[PDB]
Amino acid sequence: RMSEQGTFALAKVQVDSERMKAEEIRWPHLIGTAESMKQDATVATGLDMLYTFVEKAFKDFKVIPGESEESKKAAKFIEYCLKNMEGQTLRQFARDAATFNEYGLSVVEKVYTQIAVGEYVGKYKVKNLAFRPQASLSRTNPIVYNSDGSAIVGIKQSLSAFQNYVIIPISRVMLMNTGGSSSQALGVSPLVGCYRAWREKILIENLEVVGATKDMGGVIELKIPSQILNKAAMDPSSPEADMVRGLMSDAANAHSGEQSFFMLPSDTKDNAPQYSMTLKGIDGMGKQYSTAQLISDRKKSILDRLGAGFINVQTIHTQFVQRVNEIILEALNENLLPQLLALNDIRLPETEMPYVKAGEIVDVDMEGFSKAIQRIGAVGYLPKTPKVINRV
Amino acid sequence: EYGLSVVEKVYTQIAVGEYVGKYKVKNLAFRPQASLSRTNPIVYNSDGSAIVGIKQSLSAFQNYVIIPISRVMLMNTGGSSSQALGVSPLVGCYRAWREKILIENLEVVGA
Amino acid sequence: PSDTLRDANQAAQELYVFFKESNYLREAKIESETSFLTVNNRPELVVKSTGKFT
Amino acid sequence: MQNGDFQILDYTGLISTMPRVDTLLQSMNLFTEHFGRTTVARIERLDDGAGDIKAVQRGGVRQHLANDRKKIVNLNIPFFPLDRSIDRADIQNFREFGTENAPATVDAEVQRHMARIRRSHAILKSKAMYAALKGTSWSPDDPVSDYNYYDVWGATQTTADVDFTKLGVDPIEVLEAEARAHIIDWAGDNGDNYEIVVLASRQWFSALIAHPQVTGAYSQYPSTQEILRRRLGGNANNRIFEHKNILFIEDISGNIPAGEAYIFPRGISRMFEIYYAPSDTLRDANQAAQELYVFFKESNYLREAKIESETSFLTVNNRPELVVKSTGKF
């Protein structure tokens, strides 16, 4: 019949998922663990390359109208509104929206304003797609639900963000999340999974630096009878003291050059000699684990989650970028455009709704495209329209 | 991940639109596997012949019941038609995952 | 942070609320916790005023 | 299957036995089911009739009528829980007792417990109706209800005793005269030709057939329902007999005391009723009751499994007047 018989259980699916995580990556802490990651030169690089193509796609965007004359007028007004935000551009919005690859979540608030003077005087633009940073949100409950765990009523922002050195209704907010189903409000950050590998990768690099510094192979060792050493310590103005002070400086400067040599007395008291000079070496076998290949495995382990693992040497990286683009477009096409047209009472059928199409992330091949037009053109399957002509 | 998936179909009437008077689908409501009944998730006849419905735990209706089979769309994989609780692809992997982890731990302490 | 093991040394929130069901369909409980301090960083610009009346 | 250390043997099969569970009263469908919400119920009675008019002189005094009568009653309901648990030791090293080497599975024990609980609930429900027919509620060790309907409503128990040792006296001539007369005079409404049924213990029913009168009645010509050469009720376990526009049934269950029999009429409205109340759970609290609730819980720590079942109902007889305690002497 026409009646729901269950709940999405948003408030339970979360509370199981916070337990099943290591405690350094639960909500109020993940905000710090993200920014204490990134400073790894493989983690920054993966995120930077992802944002490189996201910005490119949302630079040369287009709005595709319908067939009727009404849709064409609506498409022009949509393009004006999206290209005339006061102090904002879609590239900035795209690079703010794509932050859910770091925190599983992204919050944008829609603000509308009236036009004073212009082509569309009397209508409503969008002033700013105000980004709400994840760090300024509520650390206790960020997202508030019904009396039951069925739906979401709004998002809470901390009171400490209104200071220099509140609950926003859900209808005003555009939510984007990734890595989880529709029942996970706090999405799974792609850095979850990487975390254990990042912890190991760091530790190994630390061992390499201290290990290389402490490999005192070939160090110089000198043996002197203790009679001379003891006499110097108690008689600072004795000939033994002068020679000991000379050794402490001469041995420090003992390099290899044009005049390097050693001259020692050859006296002998027992099976061992009184004076000797030998260069030390590891009496046995050295290290075995070859920490170099340990790090390489963990680096490929981290970059694979971001689709940027090809730097260790249609593709995987290009397909990964398309995922982020589609998530943003769904919020833009289905949450802002229908509401924006409602304010200016432009009510159209489903088939006449214009939509925004993102740009292409891979450049067109001049060699391939030019010879593709000929092959289609030489048969006559290519229409004669200004759309085809303008493509050159 | 879990061999199983439960979706409930809810229908609603149209108030104003192109097809006023007809019935849409409001939501294909996903029921998470974690919120289901931990004891018997799926209930059968008096015999083990067919399925009459799916049970959801009473603890999912709280903030911090049996749904008839005709209202539910069941998807499962890894088993025949006689295995209501399908075989998760992680079954089989499990023993290998247990070993893989242990070895990585030995490498860190060994180095 | 709340004293719960979820957020030990993790983050902070204004108000934590929890709802529990025994899973045996026989009991439930409600929880709520807060932890905050109100500080006046400059006890220099607040001036007392006492009044003798009649 | 393994024989002594150095020898083997062949396993053959499994043999299982269980006591019979009776369902005759359930089959007869004499009880109407009501699913309430609370644990208290009300019944309304309204009894009316008429008097006699006496002659008076003309032009003088007149005569006046009386008024009617009303009554109201209330009742409570008992509770019946049943629980069990399962531990590791029960399946740690015990062979399944089925195939030769299959290890014991928790599921098999769970099914055994399900079957046992269902059988116990069915037996309790069966006993409840027998207790209700006798004129009292069933609630052992629970003096909270203990409702005696004869006392609660106000009535007396008609006997209609019969002696079988008198070969020269037909026992039916006492049953008719007493039971049917009392039932007709106490039907309460204005009906006709009410059907009469009798429940008889094995001894009573067996003795009744052997009486010379009944045998002589059918012996001299075939008629139908051939007692002498066929079996009463065919090959069914529960024998059936019908004599003089009466239906006789044998009580295999043995709940009826040996030698005793109860006579009651059919068709009368709302003579028997049964009510169900919700269980002690937040899901069902203040909701509509159900016939039986069963719950199962697997411990999340993998070291326990438990089973739970509970129910709550009451059986009420609304007219103790129309039950007669037939008692035989031999």
Structure tokens at B74: 């069941």
Q: Smallest CA–CA separation between B58 and chain C, in Å?
A: 6
Residue A207, helix vs strand vs coil: helix
- Phi and psi at A253, nearest 5°, equal -90, 5
**CB within 8 Å: C6 and A138:** no
CB A7 within 8 A of CB B30: no
Sign of CA dihedral A86, A92, A94, A100: negative
- Phi and psi at C38, nearest 5°, equal -100, 120
Would you tell me which residues 25-54 of chain C have a C-beta closer than 8 angstroms to some C-beta of chain B? 25, 28, 31
Q: Smallest CA–CA separation between C7 and chain D, in Å?
A: 23
**CB within 8 Å: B64 and C31:** yes
How many of the other CB atoms lie within 10 Å of CB of D183? 20
The amino acid at C43: P
Alpha-carbon distance of A88 to A96, in angstroms, equals 11
Q: Smallest CA–CA separation between B68 and chain A, in Å?
A: 9
- Phi and psi at A344, nearest 5°, equal -95, 30
**CB within 8 Å: B62 and C17:** no
- Produce one character per residue of D35-54: b if its CB has 16 or more CB atoms within 10 Å, e if not: ebeebebeeeeeeeeeeeee
**CB within 8 Å: B58 and D283:** yes
Question: Hey, is the C-beta of C27 within 8 angstroms of any chain D C-beta?
Answer: yes
- H or E element at residue D206: helix D202-210
User: What's A25's DSSP letter?
Assistant: G
Which residues does residue A152 pair with via DSSP β-bridges, in sequence order? A145
CB D90 within 8 A of CB D109: yes
Q: Do chains D and A touch (3 or more CB pairs under 8 A)?
A: no
Gaps in chain B after residue (C–N beyond 2.5 Å): 64
Alpha-carbon distance of C50 to A268, in angstroms, equals 98
Residue A210, helix vs strand vs coil: helix
Of D282, D283, D296, the CB nearest to B39: D296
Q: Smallest CA–CA separation between B40 and chain D, in Å?
A: 7
- Per CB-CB distance under 8 Å, the chain D contacts of C21 are 282
The amino acid at D293: Y
**CB within 8 Å: B58 and D298:** no
For D114, name the nearest residue in chain B, comparing CA atoms only: B46
Technique behind the model: cryo-EM
Question: Among A4, A148, A6, A149, which residue's Cα sits nearest to residue B66?
Answer: A6
Q: Which ranges of chain A would DSSP assign to H, the alpha helix? A: 10-19, 27-36, 41-57, 69-82, 90-97, 100-103, 191-213, 226-234, 239-250, 291-304, 316-331, 337-343, 366-377, 386-389
**CB within 8 Å: C26 and D297:** no
Structure tokens at A96: 């703010």
For B41, name the nearest residue in chain D, comparing CA atoms only: D296
For B47, name the nearest residue in chain D, comparing CA atoms only: D111
Residue A88, helix vs strand vs coil: coil
- H or E element at residue D305: strand D305-311
For D300, name the nearest residue in chain C, comparing CA atoms only: C23
Q: Please calculate the CA angle B36-B40-B41 and round it to the nearest 5 degrees.
A: 35
Would you tell me which residues 145-184 of chain A have a C-beta closer than 8 angstroms to some C-beta of chain B? 145-149, 181-183
Of C19, C22, C25, the CB nearest to B63: C19
Question: Hey, is the C-beta of D296 within 8 angstroms of any chain B C-beta?
Answer: yes
Q: How far is CA A242 from CA A233, A250, A252, A267, A296, in A?
A: 11, 12, 16, 21, 54
Burial class (CB in 10 A: 0-12, 13-18, 19+), B54: buried
**CB within 8 Å: B65 and A6:** yes
Of A13, A16, A148, the CB nearest to B63: A148
Query: Up-side HSE of residue A94: CA atoms within 13 Å toward CB?
Result: 24
- Phi and psi at A90, nearest 5°, equal -65, -30
Question: Among D227, D271, D229, D222, which residue's Cα sits nearest to residue D248?
Answer: D227
Please report, to the nearest 10 degrees, the dihedral formed by the alpha carbons of residues A76, A78, A82, A86 taken in order: 90
Residues with Cβ within 8 Å of B62's Cβ and at least 6 positions away in sequence, in order, are: A11, A12, A148, A149, C19, C20, C21, C28
- Phi and psi at B34, nearest 5°, equal -60, -40
Neighbours of chain D (3+ CB pairs under 8 A): B, C
Instruction: Write down how long chain B is.
Output: 111
Residue A194, helix vs strand vs coil: helix
For A15, name the nearest residue in chain C, comparing CA atoms only: C6
Q: How far is CA A207 from CA A200, A201, A283, D27, in A?
A: 11, 10, 22, 83
Question: Among A149, C22, A156, which residue's Cα sits nearest to residue D297?
Answer: C22
The residue assigned the tokens 């599921």 is D107
DSSP per-residue string spanning chain B: --SEEEEEEEEEE-SSSTTTTSEEEEEEEEE-STTB-SS-SEEE-SSSS-EEEEEB-GGGG----EEEGGGEEEEE-SS-TT-SS---THHHHHHHHHHHHHHHHHHHHH-
CB D301 within 8 A of CB D71: no
The residue assigned the tokens 């500080």 is C39
**CB within 8 Å: A4 and B11:** no
Supply the angle between the helices A191-213 and A27-36 in degrees, to the nearest 10: 40
- Produce one character per residue of C14-44: b if its CB has 16 or more CB atoms within 10 Å, e if not: bebebbebebebeeeeeeeeeeeeeeeeeee
**CB within 8 Å: D283 and B65:** yes
Question: Among D179, D148, D201, D206, which residue's Cα sits nearest to residue D265?
Answer: D179
**CB within 8 Å: B64 and C25:** no
DSSP per-residue string spanning A272-311: SBSSEEEE---SS----S-HHHHHHHHHHHHHHTTT-GGG
State the pairing for strand pair D162-163/D324-329.
parallel
Q: Smallest CA–CA separation between B105 and chain A, in Å?
A: 10
**CB within 8 Å: C27 and D280:** no
Alpha-carbon distance of C51 to A176, in angstroms, equals 58
Alpha-carbon distance of A384 to A377, in angstroms, equals 10
What count of CB pairs under 8 Å joins B to D? 11
Of C5, C11, C14, the CB nearest to A31: C11
The amino acid at A66: G
Which residues does residue B67 pair with via DSSP β-bridges, in sequence order? B54
Q: Smallest CA–CA separation between D39 and chain B, in Å?
A: 23
Question: Which of B55, B56, B63 is most worth mutating to test chain C (most C CB atoms within 10 A of its CB)?
Answer: B63
Alpha-carbon distance of A192 to A195, in angstroms, equals 6
- Per CB-CB distance under 8 Å, the chain C contacts of D280 are 26
- Produce one character per residue of A184-212: b if its CB has 16 or more CB atoms within 10 Å, e if not: bbbbbbbbbbbbebbebbeebeeeeeeee
- H or E element at residue D183: helix D181-185
CB A176 within 8 A of CB A93: no
**CB within 8 Å: A6 and B56:** yes
Structure tokens at A32: 């710090």
Which residues does residue B25 pair with via DSSP β-bridges, in sequence order? B11
The amino acid at A160: S
Please report, to the nearest 10 degrees, the dihedral formed by the alpha carbons of residues D129, D134, D138, D142 taken in order: 180
Alpha-carbon distance of D31 to D241, in angstroms, equals 23
Alpha-carbon distance of D89 to D103, in angstroms, equals 13
Q: How far is CA C53 from CA A149, A262, C49, C50, in A?
A: 58, 102, 13, 10
Resolution of the experimental model, in Å, one decimal: 12.7
Strands (E), A46-185: 62-64, 105-114, 124-132, 143-145, 152-156, 167-169, 173-177
Alpha-carbon distance of A187 to A202, in angstroms, equals 26
Alpha-carbon distance of D13 to D21, in angstroms, equals 25
CB D247 within 8 A of CB D195: yes
State the pairing for strand pair D69-76/D305-311.
unpaired
- Phi and psi at A22, nearest 5°, equal -55, 145
- Per CB-CB distance under 8 Å, the chain B contacts of D295 are 39
Terminal-residue alpha carbon distance, chain A: 57
Question: Hey, is the C-beta of D65 within 8 angstroms of any chain C C-beta?
Answer: no
Would you tell me which residues 300-319 of chain D have a C-beta closer than 8 angstroms to some C-beta of chain B? 300
Alpha-carbon distance of B38 to B56, in angstroms, equals 9
Which residues does residue D307 pair with via DSSP β-bridges, in sequence order? D84, D296
Question: Hey, is the C-beta of C28 within 8 angstroms of any chain D C-beta?
Answer: yes
Alpha-carbon distance of A238 to A236, in angstroms, equals 6
Structure tokens at A184: 């996970």
How many angstroms from the chain centroid is the CA of residue D60?
Answer: 60
Alpha-carbon distance of D32 to D13, in angstroms, equals 44
Q: Do chains D and B touch (3 or more CB pairs under 8 A)?
A: yes
CB A185 within 8 A of CB A97: no
- Round the CA-based radius of gyration of chain D to a whole number and report it: 28
The CB-based long-range contact list for D256-260 (8 Å cut-off, 24+ gap) reads: D256/D130, D256/D199, D256/D200, D256/D201, D257/D201, D258/D201, D258/D202, D258/D203, D258/D204, D259/D201, D259/D203, D259/D204, D259/D327, D259/D328, D259/D330, D260/D201, D260/D204, D260/D325, D260/D326, D260/D327, D260/D328
State the pairing for strand pair D40-47/D69-76.
antiparallel
- Per CB-CB distance under 8 Å, the chain A contacts of C31 are none
